[PDB]
């Protein structure tokens, strides 16, 4: 059933007549499938308002969540430090999943170990696991620091990370001076971003809490930048580039951009770049600390304000036009460096692109989802473009964040038909895009299944997905993109307007039917 000259993979191989007949025989004979008319009825029902009411009355069932668990964020945070091995105290399956998830998004090796807690540890605890794991990890992978997080098993059993690490040090499993920062990252609290926050706070505390006597605020003439959970390499790069352009001394704490973007030159590099231990130890001497994603860096903020005594500025994520302007102005104020002509020109070029594309962007309706800071930044930028967000979904959002986003929407005439949903999953969003159809979705790869569903209702009901966020599995190298700053705004704007124009081209490609509007010039 294959021609050697034109070999077909699963698609469209299984569309061949013999495969079709075989599948029909299987279904009719043994699958006891519901009749196609019944399936059609149920699908149509799932697209209705009544189904939406039933869906939104869910309190125990979650379908297609838009969030992950804390240790994933802890691993991502740990990977941003120099020669640091992420270490998850708990069961091995968790680490396998974390590594696979990050490999699929970044298409890079991702280093993480587990101490393989099994049923033996379920009763006696995981102290022996911690000792052996720390010893083996240090001996094998030679990290400069081991950052310890936890899986849900360790948290439920109640493993005392501090005591276990101290006992490992006391009994000679690891050197006493070897840095082993830790954080409790319970998967049943918050989400992956919470794990990032907890891990970062643990590392900062480890390196700074007991040596605050000799620290003077602003003595190193630098600004600390805490990116938070970030899966776009361009975001790290653009923040560094913008701060270098202004001549502002900075320390990007948890920089994983080098380790997640190693070159292919015939050598495997376990470690690359990252925030050095010296930078963390000297961090309290900075002028101030800026949190790029404040809505999931609350614990970090508490630590930095309470211990380092940094007057952390009240900044939104530097996304879109106004918030990037505010970020640059605040950096200017803190550092005393004027905003250079290059950044002013880049801003003007972003405004130029907005002016060029506003006719296509204006009034477009979007359903979006993702993490709180990312989502609110995207909403703000969409409002700046004259677009109308309708369905704003943040599964791991909270009431305070929702209040903030509602305030943002109320300030704009383009936020009138917008509602914010927290604690809702992608099945809720599927219902929403069926009942109140937007023009497009903005979200991660899981939204593709929603688009598929919408297309099944009809071509006129299809809601195309625009892939911005985490994770993106079905496209290549989008992790290299930027979403922050003027450059990120330009990239997002280009993606949006060209998605609109691409969709219009598809809808107007029909010869002698719709091609009267198949304009060469758009």
């Amino acid at each position: 059933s294959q021609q050697v000259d034109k070999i077909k993979a699963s698609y469209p191989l299984f569309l061949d007549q013999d495969y079709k007949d075989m599948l029909a025989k299987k279904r009719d004979g043994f699958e006891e499938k519901y009749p196609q008319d019944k399936i059609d009825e149920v699908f149509q029902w799932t697209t209705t308002k009544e189904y939406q009411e039933l869906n939104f009355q869910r309190e125990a069932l979650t379908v297609n969540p838009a969030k992950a668990c804390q240790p994933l964020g802890a691993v991502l945070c740990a990977l941003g430090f120099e020669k640091t091995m992420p270490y998850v105290h708990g069961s091995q399956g968790c680490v396998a999943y974390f590594r696979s998830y990050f490999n699929r998004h970044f298409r890079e090796p991702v280093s993480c170990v587990s101490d393989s807690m099994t049923e033996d540890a379920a009763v006696f605890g995981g102290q022996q696991n911690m000792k052996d794991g720390l010893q083996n990890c240090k001996a094998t992978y030679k990290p400069d620091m081991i950052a310890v997080s936890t899986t849900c098993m360790a948290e439920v059993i109640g493993d005392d990370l501090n005591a276990f690490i101290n006992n490992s040090k006391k009994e000679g499993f690891i050197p006493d001076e070897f840095p082993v920062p830790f954080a409790h990252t319970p998967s049943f609290v918050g989400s992956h971003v919470t794990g990032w926050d907890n891990m970062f706070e643990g590392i900062a505390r480890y390196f700074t809490l007991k040596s605050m006597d000799d620290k003077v605020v602003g003595s190193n003439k630098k600004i600390n930048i805490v990116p938070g959970f970030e899966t776009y390499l361009g975001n790290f790069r653009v923040i560094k580039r913008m701060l270098s352009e202004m001549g502002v001394g900075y320390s990007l704490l948890s920089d994983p951009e080098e380790v997640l973007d190693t070159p292919a030159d015939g050598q495997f590099r376990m470690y690359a770049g990252g925030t050095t231990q010296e930078e963390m130890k000297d961090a309290p001497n900075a002028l101030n600390t800026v949190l790029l994603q404040p809505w999931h860096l609350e614990k970090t903020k508490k630590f930095v304000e309470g211990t380092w005594k940094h007057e952390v500025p009240k900044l939104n994520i530097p996304m879109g036009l106004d918030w990037t302007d505010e970020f640059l102005m605040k950096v200017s104020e803190i550092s005393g460096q004027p905003i250079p002509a290059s950044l002013t020109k880049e801003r003007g070029r972003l405004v130029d692109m907005m002016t060029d594309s506003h006719t296509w962007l204006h009034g477009k309706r979007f359903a979006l989802w993702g993490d709180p800071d990312f989502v609110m930044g995207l909403v703000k930028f969409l409002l700046e473009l004259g677009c109308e967000p309708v369905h704003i979904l943040c599964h791991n959002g909270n009431k305070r964040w929702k209040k903030a986003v509602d305030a943002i929407l109320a300030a704009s005439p383009y936020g009138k038909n917008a509602t914010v949903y927290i604690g809702k999953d992608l099945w809720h969003l599927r219902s929403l895009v069926f009942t109140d159809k937007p023009d497009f979705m903005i979200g991660n790869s899981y939204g593709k299944f929603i688009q598929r569903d919408t297309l099944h209702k009809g071509k006129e009901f299809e809601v195309p997905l625009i892939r911005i966020g985490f994770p993106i599995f079905d496209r290549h190298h989008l992790h290299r993109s930027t979403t922050l700053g003027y450059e990120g705004a330009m990239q997002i704007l280009t993606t949006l307007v060209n998605s609109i124009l691409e969709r219009l081209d598809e809808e107007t490609r029909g010869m002698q039917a719709t091609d009267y509007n198949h304009d060469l010039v758009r």
Partner: protein, 386 residues
């Protein structure tokens, strides 16, 4: 048991049970019982191909979870599980059964999923299968396979023991343990159907609960993955007297040998049809070999799987080991090897392609091997100025 702190890739019991055995079943809803992580990371992560209307009568690529919070850990999740089952019934009325795959906390907080499963199954007249596949159990996915097979045996397999309404034929076989990666099972099934047999049951890949229930009615059990389904296969041999055998459809040689071995378990008509099928496909796989063996002959792969590589003229050779043995394809940590400049492909098309099994899959396998091994990207690792 894995050495603590050594960066292995082994999964857990939940991955073995939910990801491998229960998850591919299409007309059942599988609840990742516990915190959100496991279901999210495992969602649509395995290419266990199926035919259905996702979200209506099929649910494979969806992630159903109880999404445990702190309250659920402290006070237990049995009430939440019952409410979740009710909500599943309301919102997905065409589901033909529910499995409850336990994550780690389920086994540590003293939740009794068996009682909830029994009560709700009796109430709703539905098969609810409690699987105690908590990730910390055992040392690998293998115990997860064992637990999932035991759940199959205890809750689904014996459902039609007293039922005699299924019309049986002497040529009834069940495909056990084929997960239909990239349609591999379909590529296998078409051959068996062309041989005169009818595949009454095929699970878990593109599997339905009814097919599992019909499995004890077949004459032969053709097992693909012995490791993951040997428990259930031996159980059905012991209880129902159904013989079972392993089949290997990887490459023309293994496919032909397996087809002849399977046909040898039936009458003369099946053997004649087997010869006809072999004769029919001979020119296709011969053309594939003629095209691709010159491009792949002599290339060395490191470490069932052997057949196709030899059919393409490749030699299976099985840190400084890689530099010493100098393999062309690792063929056995994908991105690490890729960074070292060595391709890594398995015998199943796990990542993006396939099928690889059967005569149709051999063409795809050969094309992919040639594509990856002979790609110029592997020859550009050294900068010309370095």
């Amino acid at each position: 048991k894995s050495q603590p702190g050594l960066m292995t890739i082994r999964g857990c019991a939940y991955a073995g049970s939910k990801g491998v055995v229960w998850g591919p079943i299409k007309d059942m809803i599988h609840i990742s019982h516990g915190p959100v992580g496991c279901g999210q990371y495992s969602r649509a992560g395995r290419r266990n191909y199926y035919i259905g209307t996702t979200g209506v009568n099929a649910f494979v690529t969806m992630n159903f979870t109880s999404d445990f919070q702190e309250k659920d850990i402290v006070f237990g999740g049995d009430k939440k599980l019952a409410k979740l089952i009710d909500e599943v019934e309301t919102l997905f009325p065409l589901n033909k059964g529910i499995s409850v795959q336990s994550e780690c906390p389920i086994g540590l907080i003293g939740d009794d999923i068996e009682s909830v499963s029994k009560v709700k199954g009796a109430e709703l007249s539905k098969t609810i299968v409690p699987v105690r596949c908590e990730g910390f159990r055992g040392v690998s996915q293998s115990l997860g396979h064992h637990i999932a097979n035991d759940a199959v045996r205890d809750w689904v397999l014996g459902k039609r023991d007293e039922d005699t309404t299924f019309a049986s034929t002497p040529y009834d076989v069940a495909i056990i343990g084929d997960y239909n990666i990239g349609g591999d099972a379909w590529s296998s099934r078409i051959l068996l159907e062309e041989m005169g047999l009818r595949c009454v049951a095929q699970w878990s890949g593109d599997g339905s609960i009814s097919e599992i229930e019909l499995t004890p009615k077949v004459k032969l059990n053709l097992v693909h993955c012995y490791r993951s389904m040997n428990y259930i296969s031996r159980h059905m041999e012991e209880k129902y007297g159904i013989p079972w055998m392993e089949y290997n459809f990887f490459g023309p040689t293994k496919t032909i040998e397996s087809l002849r071995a399977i046909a040898a378990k039936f009458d003369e008509s099946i053997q004649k049809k087997c010869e006809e099928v072999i004769a029919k496909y001979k020119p296709e796989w011969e053309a594939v070999v003629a095209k691709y063996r010159p491009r792949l002959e002599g290339k060395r792969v490191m470490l069932h799987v052997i057949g196709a590589y030899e059919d393409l003229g490749m030699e299976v050779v099985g840190e400084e080991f890689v530099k010493r043995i100098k393999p062309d394809l690792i063929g056995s940590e994908k991105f690490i090897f890729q960074k070292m400049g060595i391709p890594f492909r398995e015998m199943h098309s796990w990542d993006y392609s396939g099928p690889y099994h059967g005569f149709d899959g051999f063409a795809i396998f050969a094309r992919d091997m040639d594509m990856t091994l002979n790609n110029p990207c592997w020859k550009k690792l050294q900068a010309p100025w370095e």
